[PDB]
Design a protein around this ligand. Sequence first.
Ligand code: ZN
Ligand code: ZN
Lengths: 108, 298, 284, 82, 209, 235
Amino acid sequence: VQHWCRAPRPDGRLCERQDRLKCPFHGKIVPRDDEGRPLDPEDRAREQRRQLQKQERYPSLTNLKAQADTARARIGRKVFAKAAVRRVVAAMNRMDQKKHEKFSNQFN
Amino acid sequence: GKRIPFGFKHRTLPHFIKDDYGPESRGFVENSYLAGLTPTEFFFHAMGGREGLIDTAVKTAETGYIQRRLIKSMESVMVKYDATVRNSINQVVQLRYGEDGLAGESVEFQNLATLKPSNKAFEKKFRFDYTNERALRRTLQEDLVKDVLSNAHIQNELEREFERMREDREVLRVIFPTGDSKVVLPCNLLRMIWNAQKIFHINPRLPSDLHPIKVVEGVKELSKKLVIVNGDDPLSRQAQENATLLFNIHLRSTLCSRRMAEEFRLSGEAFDWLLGEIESKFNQAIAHPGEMVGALAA
Amino acid sequence: FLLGQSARDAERAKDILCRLEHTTLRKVTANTAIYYDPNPQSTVVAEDQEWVNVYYEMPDFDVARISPWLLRVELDRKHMTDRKLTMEQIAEKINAGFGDDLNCIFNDDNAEKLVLRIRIMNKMDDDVFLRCIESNMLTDMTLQGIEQISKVYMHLPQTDNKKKIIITEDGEFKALQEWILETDGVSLMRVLSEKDVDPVRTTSNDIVEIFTVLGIEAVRKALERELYHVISFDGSYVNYRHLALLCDTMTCRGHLMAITRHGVNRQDTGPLMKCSFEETVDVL
Amino acid sequence: QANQKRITTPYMTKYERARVLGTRALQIAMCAPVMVELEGETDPLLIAMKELKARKIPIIIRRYLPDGSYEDWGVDELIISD
Amino acid sequence: DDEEETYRLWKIRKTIMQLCHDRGYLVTQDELDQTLEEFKAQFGDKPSEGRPRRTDLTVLVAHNDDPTDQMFVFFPEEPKVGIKTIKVYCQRMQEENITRALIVVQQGMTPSAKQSLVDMAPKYILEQFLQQELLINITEHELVPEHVVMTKEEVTELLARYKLRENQLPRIQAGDPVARYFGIKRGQVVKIIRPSETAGRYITYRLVQ
Amino acid sequence: NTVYVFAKKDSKYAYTGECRSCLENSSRPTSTIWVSMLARAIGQRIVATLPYIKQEVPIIIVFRALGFVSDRDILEHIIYDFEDPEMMEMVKPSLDEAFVIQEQNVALNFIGSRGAKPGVTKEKRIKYAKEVLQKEMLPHVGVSDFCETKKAYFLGYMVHRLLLAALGRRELDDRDHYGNKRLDLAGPLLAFLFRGMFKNLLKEVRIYAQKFIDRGKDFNLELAIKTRIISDGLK
Ligand SMILES: [Zn+2]
Ligand SMILES: [Zn+2]
């Protein structure tokens, strides 16, 4: 992993992250010079366009939707779904299938 | 399918030490049936034989069920007087029995001559040569040489037969992407050719009497006599084209005008007999209507 | 059947292989643990603290929203490479599936131990909750490939029956010794539509799935093929008329008909033949 | 069917041959007149074979076609092979 | 992420062009084979950001002998196409005065919408296709033979030849992959030509159901 | 009287360790008991299928109902060595499943509420559970009362064997091994018949004695004993 993210950080430092493909904090990794400008002018234009797009874009009573509208509720809905638990049980049963395969030579 | 299993606790028997993977321990019999078998080989051999016995004694039920089930499925399909194949409800199952409408007890393995040979070898072997007078003198009698070498009608006929064989080669290459010439077809043409040689004492050392245009024409009328899908309207003659495409390719190539002068050396009488023979032996291969092909297939 | 140069060199074929095979997260995870870390700046673990503080100082993702509860997961190298795969894509997938609620971060693919962290960031408590997330992630987070395709094999077929047969410029036939993939699950719909998967020759031995994906004449030819292979496996021989008649009887109505009381006894044969075959009382 | 065109095969099949011999033998066994000359035969089937070989059996074969029509051939019109 | 996308959209365009060519319409050979880079040039190579947009891709082709027999090809965008967009496209097709069309959904079609397709059939004929079932042109597969839809005159010649009723032919379900590709409907007879190893070539017929 | 851990591939139980118990004397037929481990929170939860209780029961309950109430006293009987972590986290989920029932009488209610007939007084319910856990569950360990430390050790052994089978430290029992089988010669078969037929003789003598005693009159043995019962039954 040789090429570095090298994007201009808000602190004036260039990123030293050694990711093969993408920077988690700067999107796709493009080759940058010692001062962080991408070598390809077209890549620089695309990055500038992406940055510009990103920059552009009974009350006194409790609302039950507050609990329903939260990350934890969403995750609980996703994981505790009948389909999801069924897939989990299937995978764990295949794990059981391997520990059933732990008797090769003998009768088992 | 595996060596003897460890039925004791990591032992095949109590005569061996544990975790013994040697050949003796898992059941390798290093004795002939004439030298005897030592007691452990006797036991392991008994186990193997028992597998065989149970197999013979437990396959049979399922196979019997399959036989019954297929029979009841297909039983009432039969070949009709229309030459079609139909079921009891009278719906079509096959417009012609087996896509060519022949019985199965009269076909036999044959071998397409033109499928495999290279383009140059096919050129060399199946293209009649009417220019070299040497070979024509060696193979054809004098008069035939005169006519074959002067006339241009004859020469064009021969070039047309080669054109048709080239077309056939491409059609075969389409049908048989893998180049296997083993195909099963009604009349055995190599054997009929050999028979005809023997019946008429065809000396392969003297120039022959057969006129190559006789070969071309006689084969054409023959191909017209071998009728599977009768009729005259366009649809019936397209069907008759298709039903015998491959027998006609094979016939037209083996029964060529060059092969027949360099390989078989038949004479005019022999050729007439051969054509009559192919016609009859073909006409006796056709399915007899009323044949119960469903029960036969099942 | 591979299409391009992938037929010849092994590496391209192996690329396509890993691009078909299903790779859930379990297959590429070494070990996991649910820690209790209130302060990211001071992890309980020492060996991770470097890249930890390399990430948490820069505030792209809030530290206040983060819960004290942690998942830490260990990836093992040789598995991690076998699928020609890197933490970037796994990070990507975990972002995709759960969205943004599940924070993820991960070190660089240089440390001897390949590590990344999924501590959440926003009935059952968070201790139970992160166990549920762990189980769900390990079970059904698809990283690659196509479900219901477990393994995928590769070989150069000795028998000409599977080799690539071509007509050279001289008109002579010549078989080629090239790369194939024999799988273990079946999803033909997807597997056809892929880069360098030859969509003209790749088949399957599962006639129903063909019949759904290719129609009724496709399944007629396929049914012929499977039967011929079963019968003539042991060198035996059976004429073709009989095999063709069985196949054509069995597809003559447009749908696949089974040779059973369900398919044979449900067509329009008239009551008496039906009662003869099976299930007499109901029929009559 | 128009008895001018006849689509059916001009050969006596094996089934038609078997049944022609069987019927004609049973009719000889019932003292019907025989059409050819007998040397010493008394088997009804040997005589039926003699008649068929000479093409003198007075039977017509009615060949039903799957549409519904039929064709009325004499056994002497049909090419017998065996 | 995007190159896959432009590749997919180009392939689907290619298979639809072959589809319309075999369904009998006029499609210039350039469209039968338009290489990927040409598509990128004409429509853009980043559809994901929206260059091209799927709405940019619609096709309109004209039948060979009859110029008024025309057929659309609409590419909606929402993976699960609602009834509303079906109303939109029906109005589109109605006002421009064409009677045939296609849809290429991505993830599916709302049950109300497939119901609207089915119920309104006698007025105009328009069919559903998926993305995934167009990335491959099935009629090139080695198993699937060469089907050929026959005209009514040929059918009556057929049934006069073999003196059989239509119900005495083997069937092909109207929802078959190849009936759908060919767009045949109940009552039509599709002729198959496949090569047989015992006869060379064999022609069979199938009535649609 | 020996514990056999099997596993059925197409099944809803990862494992099941049965014990076809039987008091050595031919007193009653064998009363089987199973101690299974539910298939794949989704942690593995061990349960037992006692005889004459209409439902499966978490084992930790069956330990509570035997008077070993605290959790640690139970893990003394199941886990003979507190160092192996893996078996401890194998037992953890099942020790959570029944955290709710924490005292002997509560667990005895829990068991006896399943059983004979729903609407029954409390004391009969606890007597029912106690009668089961003594007389019917693992008789070969002992039918007498105060056999509860023995019963607890044996049930802990059953669970130990199950947990080893799941952790893979021992092999699943083979069914066709003859060490596991017993040939059943004329003695045992004919004693099975005699036991049944003698029971029926005794019931018939009860009927006869009862009718004549109900009519206020004495009754003769020699007419009470319908001798043909044993004669013709064996014959
Ligand atoms: Zn960076
Ligand atoms: Zn960054």
